[PDB]
Amino acid sequence: KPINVAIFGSTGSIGTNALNIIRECNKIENVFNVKALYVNKSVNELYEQAREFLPEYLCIHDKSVYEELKELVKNIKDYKPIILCGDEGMKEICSSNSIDKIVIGIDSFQGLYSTMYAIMNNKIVALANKESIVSAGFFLKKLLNIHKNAKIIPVDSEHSAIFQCLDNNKVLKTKCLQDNFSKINNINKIFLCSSGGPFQNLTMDELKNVTSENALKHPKWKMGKKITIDSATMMNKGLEVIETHFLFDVDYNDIEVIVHKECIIHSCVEFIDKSVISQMYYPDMQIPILYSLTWPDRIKTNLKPLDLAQVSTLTFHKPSLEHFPCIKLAYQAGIKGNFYPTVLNASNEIANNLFLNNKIKYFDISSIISQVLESFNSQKVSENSEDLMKQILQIHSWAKDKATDIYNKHN
Amino acid sequence: KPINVAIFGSTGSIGTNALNIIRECNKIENVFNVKALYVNKSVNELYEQAREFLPEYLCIHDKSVYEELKELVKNIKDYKPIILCGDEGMKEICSSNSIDKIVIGIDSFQGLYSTMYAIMNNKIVALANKESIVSAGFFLKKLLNIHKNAKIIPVDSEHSAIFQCLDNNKVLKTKCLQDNFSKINNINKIFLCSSGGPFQNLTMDELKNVTSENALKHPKWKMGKKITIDSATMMNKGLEVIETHFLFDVDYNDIEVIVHKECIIHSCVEFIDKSVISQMYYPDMQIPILYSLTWPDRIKTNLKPLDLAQVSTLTFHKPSLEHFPCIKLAYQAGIKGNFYPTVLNASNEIANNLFLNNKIKYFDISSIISQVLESFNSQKVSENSEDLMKQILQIHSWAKDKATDIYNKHN
Ligand SMILES: NC(=O)C1=CN([C@@H]2O[C@H](COP(=O)(O)OP(=O)(O)OC[C@H]3O[C@@H](n4cnc5c(N)ncnc54)[C@H](OP(=O)(O)O)[C@@H]3O)[C@@H](O)[C@H]2O)C=CC1
Numbered sequence: 001k002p003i004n005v006a007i008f009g010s011t012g013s014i015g016t017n018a019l020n021i022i023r024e025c026n027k028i029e030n031v032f033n034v035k036a037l038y039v040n041k042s043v044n045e046l047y048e049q050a051r052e053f054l055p056e057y058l059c060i061h062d063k064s065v066y067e068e069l070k071e072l073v074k075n076i077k078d079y080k081p082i083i084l085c086g087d088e089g090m091k092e093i094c095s096s097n098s099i100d101k102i103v104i105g106i107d108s109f110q111g112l113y114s115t116m117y118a119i120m121n122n123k124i125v126a127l128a129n130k131e132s133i134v135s136a137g138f139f140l141k142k143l144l145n146i147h148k149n150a151k152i153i154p155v156d157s158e159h160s161a162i163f164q165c166l167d168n169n170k171v172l173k174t175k176c177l178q179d180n181f182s183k184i185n186n187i188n189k190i191f192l193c194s195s196g197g198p199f200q201n202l203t204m205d206e207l208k209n210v211t212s213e214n215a216l217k218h219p220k221w222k223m224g225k226k227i228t229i230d231s232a233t234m235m236n237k238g239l240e241v242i243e244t245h246f247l248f249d250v251d252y253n254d255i256e257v258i259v260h261k262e263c264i265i266h267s268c269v270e271f272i273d274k275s276v277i278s279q280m281y282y283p284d285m286q287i288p289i290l291y292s293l294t295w296p297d298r299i300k301t302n303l304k305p306l307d308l309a310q311v312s313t314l315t316f317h318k319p320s321l322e323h324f325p326c327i328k329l330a331y332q333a334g335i336k337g338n339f340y341p342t343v344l345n346a347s348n349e350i351a352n353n354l355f356l357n358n359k360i361k362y363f364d365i366s367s368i369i370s371q372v373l374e375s376f377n378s379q380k381v382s383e384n385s386e387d388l389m390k391q392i393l394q395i396h397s398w399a400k401d402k403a404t405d406i407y408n409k410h411n
Numbered sequence: 412k413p414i415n416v417a418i419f420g421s422t423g424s425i426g427t428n429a430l431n432i433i434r435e436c437n438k439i440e441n442v443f444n445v446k447a448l449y450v451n452k453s454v455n456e457l458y459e460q461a462r463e464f465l466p467e468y469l470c471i472h473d474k475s476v477y478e479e480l481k482e483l484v485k486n487i488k489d490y491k492p493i494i495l496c497g498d499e500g501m502k503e504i505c506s507s508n509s510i511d512k513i514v515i516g517i518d519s520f521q522g523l524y525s526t527m528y529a530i531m532n533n534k535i536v537a538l539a540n541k542e543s544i545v546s547a548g549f550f551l552k553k554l555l556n557i558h559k560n561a562k563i564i565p566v567d568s569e570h571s572a573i574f575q576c577l578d579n580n581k582v583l584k585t586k587c588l589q590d591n592f593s594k595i596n597n598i599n600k601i602f603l604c605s606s607g608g609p610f611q612n613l614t615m616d617e618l619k620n621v622t623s624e625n626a627l628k629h630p631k632w633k634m635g636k637k638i639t640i641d642s643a644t645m646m647n648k649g650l651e652v653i654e655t656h657f658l659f660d661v662d663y664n665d666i667e668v669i670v671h672k673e674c675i676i677h678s679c680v681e682f683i684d685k686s687v688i689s690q691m692y693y694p695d696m697q698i699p700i701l702y703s704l705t706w707p708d709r710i711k712t713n714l715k716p717l718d719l720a721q722v723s724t725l726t727f728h729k730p731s732l733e734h735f736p737c738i739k740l741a742y743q744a745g746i747k748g749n750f751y752p753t754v755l756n757a758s759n760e761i762a763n764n765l766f767l768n769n770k771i772k773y774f775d776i777s778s779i780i781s782q783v784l785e786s787f788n789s790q791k792v793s794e795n796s797e798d799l800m801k802q803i804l805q806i807h808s809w810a811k812d813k814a815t816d817i818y819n820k821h822n
């Protein structure tokens with residue numbers, strides 16, 4: 001009586017992690033059917049996944065590699081998947097009755113489109129992509145109010161942690177990204193743990209001159225380049241503060257970022273009695289992904305057991321906002337509300353990418369973002385769902401262009 | 412629509428802690444009625460509590476201070492409690508329909524009697540007393556199977572922690588101290604945290620010569636002398652391993668003692684997927700006591716918030732069994748089963764008390780306990796509930812006398 005699951009962004013960090021925990025779990029007993037795989041342009045890698053997982057559906061977003069994908073799949077014998085392309089392909093998969101849960105491991109604002117269609121089709125959405133939440137929080141809430149059986153289950157590790165700390169008895173009275181969620185769950189405050197990233201011990205002088213190469217060495221697993229840069233600036237944690245606010249209905253004043261370099265405590269929830277519950281494991285994404293797919297239950301795994309004596313020491317310190325100004329900008333944008341989160345996310349997409357490509361320096365990232373936020377003026381929020389999406393899209397693109405403009409004017 | 416609560420052992424460490432969190436909570440809103448107070452012989456202190464809390468019932472176990480208690484209560488005007496005495500008084504309170512929950516803060520094996528009557532009357536039992544569980548685990552289970560609406564809610568801090576880490580959605584399918592509890596809750600393994608006590612850094616040479624005075628300095632709050640000595644020997648943790656086994660149906664091989672000297676993580680549960688959940692706060696008994704009385708809900712308090720940056724470092728190390736042989740003896744007794752836990756608890760009562768009164772040295776505690784365990788032979792467990800209690804009582808007294816004998820023969 002197994003779980004039918006689609007992986008969106010199957011060839012990326014989250015996607016290959018998700019396929020990995022799926023494969024391992026299926027050895028212990030067959031609980032997952034991989035029904036669909038969706039990627040952007042990694043046609044050869046998708047082919048290879050197809051040969052292993054033989055899903056009912058395959059989709060590739062980039063129209064130019066569509067034929068090529070079809071040609072490659074011909075070489076798998078006794079396998080006749082539905083091979084699809086683009087937004088249309090994505091919508092057809094979201095609307096399949098043979099699909100219960102969708103892992104969203106697509107990066108950036110782009111992730112919002114599949115997230116939205118997943119909800120609209122009343123699916124369980126195992127959402128790793130945080131940019132969607134940060135950019136479109138209010139919209140997603142409204143969609144979730146309309147689509148009663150849709151649910152977002154957080155995969156982002158801290159958010160998974162937070163969610164796992166909750167009493168499902170309370171959780172089942174509501175769902176994530178809903179008014180009153182913190183009241184129903186007796187949540188008072190959140191400790192949002194951070195690795196601190198590679199620059200955590202640098203002086204201001206050293207930070208001035210760090211390069212994307214320095215940033216790209218992230219210890220444990222290979223993540224996408226975008227989150228890796230965000231981890232280096234701690235804008236990733238800035239985004240995750242906003243994500244926390246939206247997922248769990250916690251005020252910004254009740255979200256504390258704490259640098260926990262050992263990455264064993266993944267985050268913590270203080271309840272209204274001041275008791276604190278935390279989730280712990282080695283730094284890893286297999287449990288967040290797995291839990292999203294088994295919630296409200298847990299299944300057996302053969303993961304390496306946490307050994308506290310082996311860990312020995314766990315440390316906690318506040319991040320320096322002077323060293324990590326991206327954190328402050330995120331708090332400011334979150335507290336300001338309106339579409340300030342959209343602008344924050346958009347301007348960061350551009351700043352992140354410029355720094356990645358060695359066009360700007362570290363403190364230029366924050367300086368560009370800060371200037372875009374300063375130039376933005378609050379807009380009335382559309383009451384209508386389709387208009388609100390168009391509004392989100394226009395502000396997102398304006399904010400990207402504005403970021404690019406600031407860059408181009410200082411070049 | 413408030414909670415009617417009785418405090419057994421009201422004048423002791425747990426009892427005064429329980430009255431304290433009750434008083435504080437009642438300021439935020441009136442949720443608790445203190446319906447009964449029960450003590451052994453602290454007649455003046457009980458009088459004072461009576462004047463403050465004006466409970467419906469008062470009981471004093473020691474018959475010789477009964478009249479005196481009655482005389483003192485005369486001096487409270489417009490207050491006419493039911494003033495009772497002894498086992499009879501205890502049974503009358505347990506059988507009151509005006510009492511929903513009973514905090515058991517009576518020490519030692521003696522605690523079992525009120526625990527048993529509480530269960531027999533279908534009450535919620537907020538059980539701090541662990542000696543009852545260790546000595547009579549199998550019996551309590553059978554009583555709980557018969558009394559469907561009786562429940563033990565753990566107050567012992569690690570056990571509270573463990574219980575708070577569970578999903579109440581699963582918990583409500585069962586109850587503590589029941590077959591299959593770990594299966595229903597997907598529990599795989601327990602990390603049982605320990606302060607390590609005052610002798611944690613002594614050499615073997617230093618341990619040889621420690622005194623009860625050295626032992627009695629326990630940092631944070633004043634606990635009873637008995638648990639304080641047990642903390643010094645780590646027999647307290649030995650007892651808590653057995654308690655864990657019985658409360659949560661976890662095998663001894665899945666219970667790991669870990670010394671966590673900062674006492675922030677109070678204990679941790681590994682689920683079958685290897686995700687770990689822990690409960691955290693400052694070292695304190697107010698939250699364990701409070702949770703026992705509000706479960707399955709939580710209420711607002713004004714307790715001091717946990718501040719992870721302030722804590723800064725958390726450490727974990729395995730205890731040395733050579734330094735703390737009491738731990739090993741407890742594991743051995745637990746694994747052996749039968750009435751070996753009874754004997755362990757009984758012989759420790761005597762050894763603890765001898766060391767308290769400067770009659771023996773530190774390693775004599777373990778040596779006496781070990782010898783009593785070695786002299787014990789498994790007995791067939793009575794099938795009948797009343798006979799099983801008599802059997803528990805006979806073995807408990809035999810084991811005390813045996814401990815005393817070993818002492819007297821080496822003196
Ligand atoms: N890596 C991690 O451990 C964590 C990541 N996250 C979040 O998860 C998301 C994914 O990150 P990560 O896995 O690192 O990113 P990667 O760059 O590693 O992977 C991105 C994936 O998305 C696919 N993709 C891109 N555009 C499209 C599109 N239009 N349609 C379909 N698929 C598309 C890519 O396909 P292609 O291969 O064809 O380019 C690729 O499979 C991000 O939002 C990130 O913040 C959150 C927590 C941790």
Ligand SMILES: NC(=O)C1=CN([C@@H]2O[C@H](COP(=O)(O)OP(=O)(O)OC[C@H]3O[C@@H](n4cnc5c(N)ncnc54)[C@H](OP(=O)(O)O)[C@@H]3O)[C@@H](O)[C@H]2O)C=CC1
Binds near residue numbers: 451519636
């Ligand atoms: N202190 C703590 O923080 C913790 C304690 N515990 C457990 O809780 C229990 C209580 O410990 P603690 O509070 O330290 O002990 P204390 O010695 O501080 O208090 C014992 C209490 O029990 C009462 N008592 C003794 N015999 C009887 C009797 N026959 N009838 C009624 N009341 C009686 C005493 O009354 P009187 O004042 O008249 O002598 C006193 O009120 C123990 O089993 C201990 O292991 C567990 C976790 C932590």
Ligand SMILES: CCCCCCOc1cccc([C@H](SCC(=O)N(C)O)P(=O)(O)O)c1
Binds near residue numbers: 195223227261262285
């Ligand atoms: C074993 C030596 C430590 C290994 C460090 C592994 O990296 C981690 C570990 C945890 C968190 C993160 C963040 S980025 C990726 C992310 O968002 N995740 C995983 O949810 P952060 O830097 O923003 O806090 C990175």
Ligand SMILES: CCCCCCOc1cccc([C@H](SCC(=O)N(C)O)P(=O)(O)O)c1
Binds near residue numbers: 630634642672674
């Ligand atoms: C602030 C500096 C640290 C303060 C230490 C406070 O003492 C504690 C703290 C926690 C545990 C205990 C044990 S004894 C008492 C007990 O059983 N409890 C509270 O449930 P242990 O020694 O057996 O682990 C004692």
Ligand SMILES: [Mn+2]
Binds near residue numbers: 158
């Ligand atoms: Mn994260």
Ligand SMILES: [Mn+2]
Binds near residue numbers: 567568569651
């Ligand atoms: Mn304890």
